[PDB]
Design an enzyme around this catalytic site. Structure first.
Site, PDB file in Angstrom:
ATOM      1  N   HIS B  41      26.673  71.919  34.504  1.00  0.00           N
ATOM      2  CA  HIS B  41      26.085  71.993  35.846  1.00  0.00           C
ATOM      3  C   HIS B  41      26.920  71.298  36.918  1.00  0.00           C
ATOM      4  O   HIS B  41      26.548  71.360  38.090  1.00  0.00           O
ATOM      5  CB  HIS B  41      24.610  71.546  35.903  1.00  0.00           C
ATOM      6  N   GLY B 143      23.717  60.767  39.593  1.00  0.00           N
ATOM      7  CA  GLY B 143      25.115  60.462  39.294  1.00  0.00           C
ATOM      8  C   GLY B 143      25.347  60.025  37.848  1.00  0.00           C
ATOM      9  O   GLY B 143      26.498  59.891  37.409  1.00  0.00           O
ATOM     10  N   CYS B 145      24.583  61.796  35.178  1.00  0.00           N
ATOM     11  CA  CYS B 145      24.844  62.964  34.302  1.00  0.00           C
ATOM     12  C   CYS B 145      26.208  62.881  33.667  1.00  0.00           C
ATOM     13  O   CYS B 145      27.158  62.456  34.310  1.00  0.00           O
ATOM     14  CB  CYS B 145      24.669  64.286  35.038  1.00  0.00           C
TER      15      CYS B 145
END
Ligand SMILES: N#CC1CN(S(=O)(=O)N2Cc3ccc(Cl)cc3[C@H](C(=O)Nc3cncc4ccccc34)C2)C1
Ligand SMILES: N#CC1CN(S(=O)(=O)N2Cc3ccc(Cl)cc3[C@H](C(=O)Nc3cncc4ccccc34)C2)C1
Ligand SMILES: [Cl-]
Ligand SMILES: [Cl-]
Lengths: 298, 305
Positions: B41, B143, B145
């Site tokens: 993503h 942030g 991820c």
């Protein structure tokens, strides 16, 4: 979202851990530049008399699969400083700092100079730590990391009869009225770190847990009379000032939150939890709450 | 003595964390040898998240659209491919700090350490468990991820989790390092919710054996139970069914303490009925389920108090 007991990343400290052996005793040492720091009870008491009988080659220092050569030795309070021929190439930027009760730090638990785990803990008001240590853990260190600088604040020396732990700063001064000898020693009656419980209540509000909030306020003196009754440490004006930023972020005055704490002490949680806990948590400082709810990196 | 929620030392993982940027999105990547692994993503633009076509978004990208930063050094991307929900970025430099490692897919109930990172920089380390509903109760902000979960048994790092998203209840969902999500989750902003969570029964039993090893027996009783009667009771408190595999796994702790698994089950049944009555077990007023039988053996002494 979420709130966990979080430790600092231990990498910079892992690269300093070594094994120190003297006779039949093996424990952990901290290798910074050309000096290895370890508890003086590795020579085991008259420490000057025991130490004078030792030569450099009596101390075996192992860093991974490499033997370090001891070329000098000296004692500073309850810490033994072993001069080695090799400077640690992995020495981080560091300071030795002495902490106060209520302050938190990360512990890298080691056995035979090899790190096994990392956990977060607080220096209790009675100067002990509720750690997790087995035989051979002596010499394991406590630290905080600020930007790129590791501040070493604790070195493990012993376990008390109640299962809690005692140690020194990196200059060898004990935290608490403890001595490095096998004598009748006991932890004093402990108290709850009030400013930390308040910080954790602010963290619960930030994460959406608000059931304990109320319309009431209190004076500092009335709150302190209630705090004394429940074995809670006195809350000072310094604590109120330190909680200022969390009070501004949530819109709840410190004395407004003190009124919530007073009600929790007088009535309990009544089947409810706060941040997944049925007890009031006191091992997160105001700074830990700010750091975890802002994502500060190292 | 003592019992703490202990994480593995994070050093071997810190040396693998990098920052990955694609357009306006910045997240964390795991640099092992000449490949950087990160959530796919990173190529989406928020609006894309409703119904993203990853194959269509990825075909429009070239190697130089991905910026990878390792400390203060830019890595050059020389290849890219998608494997399930993970993007694998081939770089021109092999990580000199690559530890001995494996990619392992874990089961619910298993624990692991999480190195939480922002902008490729580690901020903290904590201990977690894969919940029975396949979510993790983590501590992650925007942030985070690409942060990873791992175990280090012996000198080998076993990567088991990569963080992808936060669900509406504040819990977290992610994938193994081959990009397969844990649970019925998708890397898409759809109506997704964690299923009803349950307590990890085999872990609560392991933690009760840890309490006995550390010198506490107040919660024990003179009763025993059959496995079926235990499960009928446990299911009423939202506890996971205890299987014969769980009973076998608890064998070593049963032998070290001298307390049969079904006698420890009878103690648990009574604790669920009575509560703790002002008492604590290993400093907790709740029954702890994020220590596996293996974690208890790892941390506790071999000699019972
Ligand atoms: N109370 C109590 C316990 C600790 N003792 S002992 O005799 O093993 N012990 C006396 C002693 C005296 C002074 C000094 Cl400075 C160190 C030490 C040592 C010490 O406490 N080591 C430890 C440290 N941490 C965790 C331990 C767990 C298990 C056993 C030792 C552990 C050794 C019985
Ligand atoms: N529920 C809920 C929250 C998360 N959203 S979001 O719109 O910011 N979000 C949709 C989304 C959808 C699918 C996927 Cl795969 C990733 C993502 C991203 C994601 O979850 N990021 C995060 C990850 N972890 C911890 C976060 C904390 C705080 C904010 C973002 C966080 C972005 C609102
Ligand atoms: Cl691989
Ligand atoms: Cl597993």
């Amino acid at each position: 979202s979420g709130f966990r007991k979080m430790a600092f990343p231990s990498g910079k400290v892992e690269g300093c851990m070594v094994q120190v052996t003297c006779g039949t005793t093996t424990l952990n040492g901290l290798w910074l530049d050309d000096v290895v720091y370890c508890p003086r009870h590795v020579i085991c008491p008259n420490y000057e008399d025991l130490l004078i009988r030792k030569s450099n080659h009596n101390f075996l220092v192992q860093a991974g699969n490499v033997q370090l050569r001891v070329i000098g030795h000296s004692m500073q309070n309850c810490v033994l400083k072993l001069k080695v021929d090799t400077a640690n190439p992995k020495t981080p930027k560091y300071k030795f700092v002495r902490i106060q009760p209520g302050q938190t730090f990360s512990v890298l638990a080691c056995y035979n100079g090899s790190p096994s785990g990392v956990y977060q803990c607080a220096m209790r008001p009675n100067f002990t730590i509720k750690g997790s240590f087995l035989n051979g853990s002596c010499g394991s260190v406590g630290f905080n990391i600020d930007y790129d600088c590791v501040s070493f604040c604790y070195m493990h020396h012993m376990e008390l009869p109640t299962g809690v732990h005692a140690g020194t700063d990196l200059e060898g001064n004990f935290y608490g009225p403890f001595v490095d000898r096998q004598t009748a020693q006991a932890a004093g009656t402990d108290t709850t770190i009030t400013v930390n419980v308040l910080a954790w209540l602010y963290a619960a509000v930030i994460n959406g847990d608000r059931w304990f909030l109320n319309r009431f306020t209190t004076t500092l003196n009335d709150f302190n009379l209630v705090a004394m009754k429940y074995n809670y440490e006195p809350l000072t004006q310094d604590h109120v000032d330190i909680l200022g930023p969390l009070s501004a972020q949530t819109g709840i005055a410190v004395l407004d939150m003190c009124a919530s704490l007073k009600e929790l002490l007088q009535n309990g949680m009544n089947g409810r939890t706060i941040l997944g806990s049925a007890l009031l948590e006191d091992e997160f400082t105001p700074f830990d709450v700010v750091r975890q709810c802002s994502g500060v990196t190292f």
